[PDB]
Write a protein that binds this ligand. Structure first.
Ligand SMILES: O=C(NO)c1ccc(CN(Cc2cccnc2)S(=O)(=O)C2CCCC2)cc1
Ligand SMILES: [K+]
Ligand SMILES: [K+]
Ligand SMILES: [Zn+2]
Length: 355
């Protein structure tokens, strides 16, 4: 029952040349790593090395032109970095950004390989920049390449094309890129919980609503759980898992679970406005560990309170290592009941576990 951990300080080099306080900070990953040492988790893990994804591995999900554009930024002067970055929704670029995005993906590929070949049972990937907003053909929302989507395809490339991969995306934002990549795919089940606010919260698209269930043979394999009008936390996330995430995931019977684990829904996050606790994230991790024979890979996405993300992600690793889960409690906010029931009705036709 070995737990793997991948972290490489080099991923700190991606930075914002124009705003030292921009929340997607280099030290997001170093602080999470430090907390693993401070709590004596690091020495309990098997250290998986980082590596660069290849351009051909990026082609598992991304266009040749998109790869070339981000690749070219390694050599741009600040004026061109500014202008290129501004062509996307919510992107800053430095000369190190391409290499950091390659390291984040390659790290996750090595973690998936270690799990699927039985070298470790589960793993955590402390990586930046994030991935879940990146589309096949564009960067978006701090993300250059879709690390989680690429890891699902990489996992399939080294196993079989029909490998059943579950992606649970608990970042406070909808993973538009991940949804779109797998929207017509019945081999990758995408489940997102996210603040939505009737389309008003980033990334500001009705694609994140509950009635988007997938397309074609993918119908039923895209599960959006959108929150509106409330400061959601442990009660609402635990109820979403109990009524939705776990029954669906158990019926799907994945062979590999990837977590797009942003910690921006955490209590204390300056952007998310939510109040999930570190014990709440530990609960969610422990629930997912009952799937896929425990084959869970936790991939950092967003999360901007350094203290909050460090404690939260460390608690997830504690669960992966087999430590006893914390006990949690307790009325939901009323709009969360509405949201959950809206998803249930959208997905009851496709999942017998919901009937
Ligand atoms: O975490 C993420 N994804 O997983 C994430 C992705 C993108 C952003 C960008 N921001 C939007 C925002 C603000 C508050 C809360 N959520 C999102 S923004 O910086 O304000 C940008 C908008 C237009 C001008 C600046 C932030 C987080
Ligand atoms: K999400
Ligand atoms: K899908
Ligand atoms: Zn986010």
């Amino acid at each position: 029952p070995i737990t793997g951990l991948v972290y490489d300080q080099r991923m700190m080099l991606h930075h914002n040349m124009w705003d030292s306080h921009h929340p997607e900070l280099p030290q997001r990953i170093s602080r999470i790593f430090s907390r693993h040492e401070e709590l004596r988790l690091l020495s309990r893990c098997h250290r998986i090395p980082a590596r660069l994804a290849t351009e051909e591995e990026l082609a598992l999900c991304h266009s040749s032109k998109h790869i070339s554009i981000i690749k070219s930024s390694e050599h741009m002067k600040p004026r061109d970095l500014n202008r290129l970055g501004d062509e996307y929704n919510s992107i800053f670029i430095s000369n190190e950004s391409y290499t950091c995005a390659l390291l984040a993906a390659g790290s996750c590929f090595n973690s998936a390989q270690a799990i699927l070949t039985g070298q470790v049972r589960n793993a955590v990937a402390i990586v930046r920049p994030p991935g879940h907003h990146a589309e096949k053909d564009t960067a978006c929302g701090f993300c250059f390449f879709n690390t989680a989507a690429l890891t699902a395809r990489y996992a399939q490339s080294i196993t079989r094309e029909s490998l059943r991969v579950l992606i649970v995306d608990w970042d406070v934002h909808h993973g538009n890129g991940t949804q779109h990549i797998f929207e017509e795919d019945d081999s990758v089940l995408y489940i997102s919980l996210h603040r939505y606010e009737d389309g008003a919260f980033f990334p500001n698209s009705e694609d994140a609503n509950y009635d988007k269930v997938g397309l074609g043979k993918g119908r039923g394999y895209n599960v959006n759980i959108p929150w509106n009008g409330g400061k959601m936390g442990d009660p609402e996330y635990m109820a979403a898992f109990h009524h939705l995430v776990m029954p669906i995931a158990r019926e799907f019977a994945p062979e590999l679970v990837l977590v797009s684990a942003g910690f921006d829904a955490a209590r204390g996050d300056p952007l998310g406005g939510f109040q999930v606790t570190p014990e709440g994230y530990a609960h969610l991790t422990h629930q997912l560990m009952s799937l896929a024979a425990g084959r869970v890979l936790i991939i950092l996405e967003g999360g901007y309170n350094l203290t909050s993300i460090s404690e939260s992600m460390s608690m997830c690793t504690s669960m992966l290592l087999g430590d006893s889960p914390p006990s949690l409690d307790t009325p939901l906010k009323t709009s969360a009941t509405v949201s959950i029931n809206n998803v249930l009705r959208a997905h009851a036709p496709f999942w017998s576990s919901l009937r």
